[PDB]
Ligand binder design. Structure first.
Ligand code: HEM
Ligand code: HEM
Ligand code: O
Lengths: 356, 681, 678
């Protein structure tokens, strides 16, 4: 909470540029520490202290934590013998502004005309995402803009999106009940660039990813869930065994469990008894909670699985083993499948695209 | 070294390159500019981090006692006093505890003169091994008011008028004497402040008082009422008002320079810690209520018992970080000491904790190096502005299974915890009154006046005369007269003369009782070490060689000698232009220097006209020992002083040295001050 | 009434019962206690709200200029100055703007003496109808340093030594003169502070200067370089150092009481606002760079042109809320004015905004009554500590469809917005350097010294002699002499005498004999003696008091403040000898018959310190004041070795003394009583 970042925390060998956003940040971060720490000595706090040593003629201030020896706290001075001494580019490893930087032109309250294109690179970014990745962007916009009560603002938003892509504006306009505007091709283009997409690449490792194992205290499901858990942990996964209560080997109750906590959900064999009938109706958890966890995990694109007879749990929510990211069969097959699925992480086959 | 613990926070910049406050070597003598004669750039991070720290240097001055100075030292107990207190720092003979002491005035702001007339603060912190114990005292044993809720009224009335902020550091204005006359409990402290206690010669020449009755408590819970006393081993000594006034202009740092010089020269000042001890069942047995802070306990009823000695022998390294930032509290109490139901002390406990939030602008001020105890802090406090530690215990609450019970409760029988005096009780109705035992506002002011010497009494009357003559309102002055008349009809009569008001007796509280230990001028000093002699000389003739030999012999006795002349020739410490009699405790004219007291040598571009005659005149008129060697006798003659007057020494070097050193013990020669009735025909 | 807008925040407690800060009538003279002699209860909410507020009264003093006093007034424009500036408060003849001015010293803390020797602040706020415009000036036209990044260095060196915090409000110590000699740009302001400008008689007797070159800008963007000047209508007047030292102890409030009294008695002080105006192309035309704040522009090259007059006629009602809390800023600029590339001014703009965060502990200090503009505040700032308004505009951002564009942008053409001078350009490399045109630190100090009268020069010599003699380090004193030698060989030699050192050989590089007008104090008599003060030394015995009353009545007819002094406060006596000192008066007059307290029995009363009447008269003579005695009282003058034929000493009948004293007060200080080297 106390650490105080600053873009002006710069060292020899680095300099700024005339980026007008950066320029004002340098002022704002120093000044704002005076509010958050109500004093000028916040760099003396342990988490803010440098390791290299502080030697200057600053004194006093609220919460002054040091006692300075040098009583000639000024420069230049004969009485301190020139110490602390000036450092620059040539002596003392001092900071220095880049020697070649020049100023030229009128003092202005303006921005360079070179800044005026606000649409090309939004179009470039959208172009460089996968089709369902693109649909995530449009569905975010659809959700967000649907909260705007003012009609004119919504049309203003559409007018601006239409300058990025006519198809984006058309697809957002449907959610808003607004007309598809006519193409404004000035900034349209089809170029792509690497390194901006998330969903076009599988994960380099699955270590620390979380597997929820839905089990039950009745029968022999928990012993199988423990065996499933110990194998998954060998790959560096964090595995939570879930049941009706905290029996031996249970990490969490159904009452406290949610699919949002896990990157994969697998039903232990025998636990299909909590997905329909009497085992699904219990005072120890909200009605339908095990089915809701599997439904959530499926609908949010996670790897989902069931071992042996627990395939019935997949059937009870209309999910088929045919599907990508869905695994059934015996334990070793489900383990290998779930582990492969975590590399994919999100199975975008389960998300509808406009006109698909 | 009493400052030893502070060495881990000390910063040495010698031999180093300049840096920012976040590291990185820099230059910070030129702003970054857009072109040769261009404007300064916002990206000059070096400029802004430099000037931001400058712009935020100041913190609020103390709401009272803003003006003062302090030093580190050692307290040594003279014995194992566990028969009267469980306090650790008093638990063994020759047990040593580091101290810090700050002295101060009260009314004036941070930059006002040391030699204003005022009550003086005398605050000691003991860094004991069972926490910080503070005795936040004054150089006067009684306070103005009886209930802490009245403190803003007193302080508002003696501080400057709120419309023009006039006058600085002075009680000599309408509102102060309106309050003194409307709130007669104030008359006792007023008399003390009108005496030598109001204009002491130095911090080292003051006694100190806790004022309040406190309690000492033993391990088994038995208690005794106690008054704290500091007895100066340098002797009490005071100026005269007409000299203190000039000194306020010539050297506003007179007292803080005095203490700093005494410590640097190896003449560390000392005070003995002494107590008066009273049985609980005798709290109301000495003619007043010992809960009443407007009273002191006469030593004839309970004598002083010395417990130990404090010696102040280290100056601070950075005044701001140590002296300005230190936060005294009467709530800084330890096992073996307890409070009393004194209604003034009661509210102080709240007020000194609260005011730290204003001065330090955060609740972690006890983490400042000068405020930290040496004994260790272990509790469940967390966060706060400027939190300087990183706590390991994540279970920051009690009671708790998870933290195993630690940090654990300490009380009377476990962990040497603090405990309130076990026998203390409350009885009666909740009330907004004061006990009728507090009613007498005049008897002890009269006892104090009765116990001063005749010229000392005249100093008191002349201070009131000076102060009350500044009161513009006629009725306030008459109100002051009526209240003074209740203490002493003669005092009221003699004050009335100066005010042009009419002199009748009101004898309800009159009496003739005296008590010891409240006078200053009835006793000579036990040592003249560190006292200052100004040797007036000249650069023409042989006077300087003689002045140097005079200085040499005087310095052998521990005196600080300043040889003065027209310019800084070899052997001269100060010029006449820069010299004034207020800086010295005695003035000696070196032989031959009589040439600068008349004729050509007295009119020179190098110093103001008449300056050597003025230094000698001031010195004589202010009661100092004055002297002239050999032919310099003529300088005494030129100002009309005779060679055989008390405290005047003429003759050869050896007898002058001897006479001056004897006169420094007397310190002030009071036959030079007229007393009412002296001028009658 | 200049204070009219402040009347809605004034609070009258007369006729009322005491309350808490949250309402409810209370008593607050007794703590709540458990039993008759019992402990105070935590539930005494009355006690804690009263003491909490007292406990938190103090705010940090100003980092510099901590010691000062101020007043309200009116500024009146003498003309329509639209030909040189778009500034609205200068836009019509007889246009009136409320002002508040604070005067100050620099080094001392809040309780330090007014008559310490120092540079003096002279800060003026115009509450214009287009925002607050501050001229944050000094009583001296040049500053110590050339780049704002060196301000902590200067101030640390002048302020008390950081080990013991000694000395208070004084440059007379090692670190300051080490700095003056290590940083030679400081010598010009140093000389000014060593002159009468360092010990002025009153705030009302100081000129004022913006110091920096600014720009005036017309509606069409044309600009002129400008120097701001305040010219006192009371005349410039100074004390002598040996007098200012005594006055520092006898009345630390000498200057703040002088201004308070003058306003309260109907003697409102006035200053004329005047400018020097030069073209852009003159920035380096006069042998120095006009961006250099260690140089002033001689009036021979550009004369003063008066624009209007300011008169201070209202004292504050609450010092703290008005004088203490007011926050000046050179950034308080309005349309029609612009900055220059003065590297000292440049950094001030950052510093005064930032420091308010420390002094007021929050971002809303402009909302305080003394800081508020009269022209209205409309922007999208919100929240912050102590937010005192309730904003109606919920769309607190721009640009925005939903707020319909309001508040709207204002610039040169729309809405009378501020605008930077359109022709200003930047050229060259980013640099941490100063222009070589800033190099000469000695010519103008010499010019200043050359332009003082011979005794006025001795005062500067004797100030340096006094100051430098406190420097304990031998080499620093030698470095001082080497730097003084570059200004004047004679100055160095005369200074070296007091130091017992040998002055270096002449260094003629910067020597010259040029003089310039308007920088001297003692070469001009005072234009008015109104508000000047006469101490009348009388006695209660005999008929002296009646004559002193008649002498007082006649003197008051010429606008003088008269204090009749005697042994005690008899009828007609203003002050006792015990309370009196010569520092309080501009002239001292012994009333006939009062010679009886200068010798014999009458001089030995217990009612005052020995010799007090003779010391008052002695002090007044030696400090250069007009002194006089009526009739038989000339024995008092003879008792101190002074005689009637001297300049500024008057004797004879009452009619003769009054006429002589009043004309002597115009001269103010008689310089024939001060010895000059040689
Ligand atoms: C016997 C009565 C009193 C004595 C001997 C006394 C003594 C002192 C002393 C010596 C100081 C300055 C300590 C230092 O040098 O830092 C001080 C400060 C102070 N006093 Fe008192 N005082 C008394 C009464 C009171 C009362 C009744 C109150 C309020 C209820 C009060 C409130 C304060 C405050 C708020 C400070 C400022 C503390 C700080 O800023 O650190 N005093 N007092
Ligand atoms: C020509 C040069 C300067 C002049 C004429 C000048 C004048 C003044 C004056 C008159 C005040 C007192 C305002 C008042 O009465 O409240 C003041 C205060 C102050 N000055 Fe300057 N000064 C100068 C240089 C500087 C510089 C170079 C800096 C820093 C870069 C600086 C920083 C400050 C600050 C921080 C205050 C305190 C303001 C406040 O607390 O409200 N000054 N100055
Ligand atoms: O300043």
């Amino acid at each position: 909470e106390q650490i105080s970042f600053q873009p002006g925390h710069i060292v020899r060998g680095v300099d700024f540029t005339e980026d007008p956003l950066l320029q004002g940040r340098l002022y704002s971060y120093l000044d704002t520490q005076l509010n958050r720490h109500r004093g000028p000595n916040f760099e003396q706090l342990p988490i803010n202290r440098p390791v290299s040593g502080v030697h200057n003629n600053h004194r006093d201030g609220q919460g002054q934590a040091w006692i300075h020896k040098n009583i000639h706290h000024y420069s230049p001075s004969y009485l301190n013998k020139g110490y602390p001494a000036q450092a620059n580019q040539t002596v003392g490893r001092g900071f220095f502004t880049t020697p070649g930087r020049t100023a030229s032109g009128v003092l202005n309250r303006e921005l360079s005309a070179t800044f005026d294109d606000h649409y090309t690179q939004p179009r470039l970014f959208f172009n460089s995402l996968t089709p369902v990745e693109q649909q995530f962007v449009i569905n975010a916009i659809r959700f967000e803009a649907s909260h705007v009560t003012n009609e004119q603002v919504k049309k203003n938003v559409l007018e601006q999106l239409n300058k990025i892509s006519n198809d984006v504006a058309k697809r957002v306009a449907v959610a808003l009940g607004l007309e598809a505007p006519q193409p404004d091709p000035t900034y349209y283009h089809n170029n792509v660039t690497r390194g901006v997409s998330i969903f076009n690449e599988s994960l380099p490792t699955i270590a620390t990813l979380r597997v929820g194992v839905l089990s039950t205290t009745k029968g022999g499901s928990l012993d199988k869930a423990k065996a499933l858990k110990e194998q998954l942990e060998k790959d560096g996964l964090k595995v939570t065994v879930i049941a009706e209560y905290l029996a031996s080997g249970v990490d969490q109750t159904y009452s406290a469990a949610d699919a949002t906590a896990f990157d994969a959900v697998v039903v232990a064999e025998g636990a299909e008894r909590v997905f329909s009938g009497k085992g699904a109706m219990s005072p120890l958890f909200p009605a339908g909670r095990p089915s809701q966890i599997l439904t959530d995990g499926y609908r949010w694109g996670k790897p989902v699985a069931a071992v042996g007879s627990a395939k019935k749990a997949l059937q009870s929510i209309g999910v088929e083993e045919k599907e990508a990211g869905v695994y059934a069969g015996a334990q070793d097959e489900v383990i290998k499948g779930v582990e492969e699925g975590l590399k994919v992480f999100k199975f975008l086959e389960r998300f509808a695209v406009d006109g698909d | 070294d009493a400052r030893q613990r502070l060495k881990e926070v000390e910063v040495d910049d010698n031999g180093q390159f300049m840096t920012t406050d976040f590291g990185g070597n820099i230059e910070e003598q030129f702003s970054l500019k857009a072109g040769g004669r261009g404007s300064t750039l916002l990206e000059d991070f070096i400029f802004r981090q430099k000037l931001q720290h400058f712009d935020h240097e100041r913190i609020p001055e103390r709401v009272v006692h803003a003006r003062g100075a302090g030093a580190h030292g050692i307290f040594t107990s003279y014995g194992d006093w566990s028969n009267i207190t469980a306090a650790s720092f008093l638990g063994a003979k020759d047990k040593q505890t580091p101290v810090f002491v700050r002295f101060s005035t009260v009314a004036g702001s941070r930059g006002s003169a040391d030699t204003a007339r005022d009550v003086h603060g005398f605050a000691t912190r003991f860094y004991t091994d069972e926490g910080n114990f503070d005795i936040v005292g004054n150089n006067i044993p009684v306070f103005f008011i009886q209930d802490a809720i009245r403190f803003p009224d007193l302080i508002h009335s003696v501080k400057p008028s709120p419309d023009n902020e006039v006058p600085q550091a002075a009680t000599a204005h309408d509102s102060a004497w309106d309050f003194f006359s409307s709130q007669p409990s104030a008359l006792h402290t007023l008399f003390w402040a009108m005496s030598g206690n109001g204009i002491p010669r130095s911090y080292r020449h003051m006694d100190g008082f806790g004022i309040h009755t406190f309690r000492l408590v033993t391990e088994d819970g038995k208690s005794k009422l106690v008054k704290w006393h500091w007895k100066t081993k340098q002797g009490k000594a005071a100026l005269v008002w007409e000299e203190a006034q000039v000194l306020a202009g010539k050297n506003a740092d007179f007292h803080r320079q005095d203490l700093w010089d005494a410590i640097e020269s190896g003449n560390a000042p000392s005070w003995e810690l002494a107590v008066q001890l009273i049985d609980e069942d005798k709290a109301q047995a000495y003619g007043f209520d010992l809960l009443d802070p407007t009273k002191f306990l006469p030593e004839e009823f309970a004598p002083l018992q010395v417990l130990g000695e404090m010696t102040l022998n280290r100056n601070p390294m950075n005044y701001f970080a140590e002296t300005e930032q230190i936060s005294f509290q009467p709530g800084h109490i330890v096992r073996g000491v307890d409070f009393t139901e004194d209604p003034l002390l009661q509210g102080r406990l709240y007020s000194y904790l609260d005011t730290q939030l204003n001065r330090h602008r955060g609740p972690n001020f006890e983490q400042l190096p000068i405020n930290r105890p040496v004994s260790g802090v272990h509790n469940n406090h967390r966060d706060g502005q400027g939190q300087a530690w990183i706590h390991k215990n994540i279970h920051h609450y009690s009671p708790s299974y998870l933290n195993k019970g630690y940090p654990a409760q300490a009380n009377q029988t476990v962990g040497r915890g603090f405990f309130t005096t076990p026998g203390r009780t409350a009885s009666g109705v909740l009330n907004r009154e004061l006990s009728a035992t507090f009613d007498d506002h005049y008897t002890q002011p009269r006892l104090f006046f009765n116990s001063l010497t005749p010229v000392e009494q005249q100093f008191v009357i002349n201070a009131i005369r000076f102060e009350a003559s500044h009161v513009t309102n006629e009725q306030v002055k008459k109100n002051v007269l009526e209240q003074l008349n209740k203490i002493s009809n003669d005092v009221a009569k003699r004050v009335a003369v100066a005010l042009g008001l009419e002199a009748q007796p009101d004898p309800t509280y009159y009496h003739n009782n005296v008590t010891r230990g409240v006078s200053i001028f009835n006793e000579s000093l036990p040592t003249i070490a560190t006292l200052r002699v100004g040797v007036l000389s000249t650069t023409k003739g042989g006077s300087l060689d003689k002045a140097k030999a005079l200085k040499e012999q005087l310095e052998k006795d521990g005196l600080k000698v300043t040889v003065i002349a027209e310019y800084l020739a070899s052997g001269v410490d100060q010029t006449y232009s820069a010299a004034d009699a207020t800086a010295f405790d005695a003035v000696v004219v070196a032989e031959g220097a009589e040439r600068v007291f008349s004729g050509k040598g007295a009119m020179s571009p190098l110093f103001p006209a008449g300056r050597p005659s003025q230094i000698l005149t001031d010195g004589y008129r202010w009661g100092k020992p004055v002297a002239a060697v050999g032919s310099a006798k003529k300088a005494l003659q030129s100002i009309g002083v005779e060679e055989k007057e008390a405290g005047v020494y003429a003759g050869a070097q050896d007898e002058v040295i001897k006479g001056v050193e004897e006169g420094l013990k007397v310190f002030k020669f009071l036959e030079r001050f007229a007393v009412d009735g002296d001028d009658e025909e």
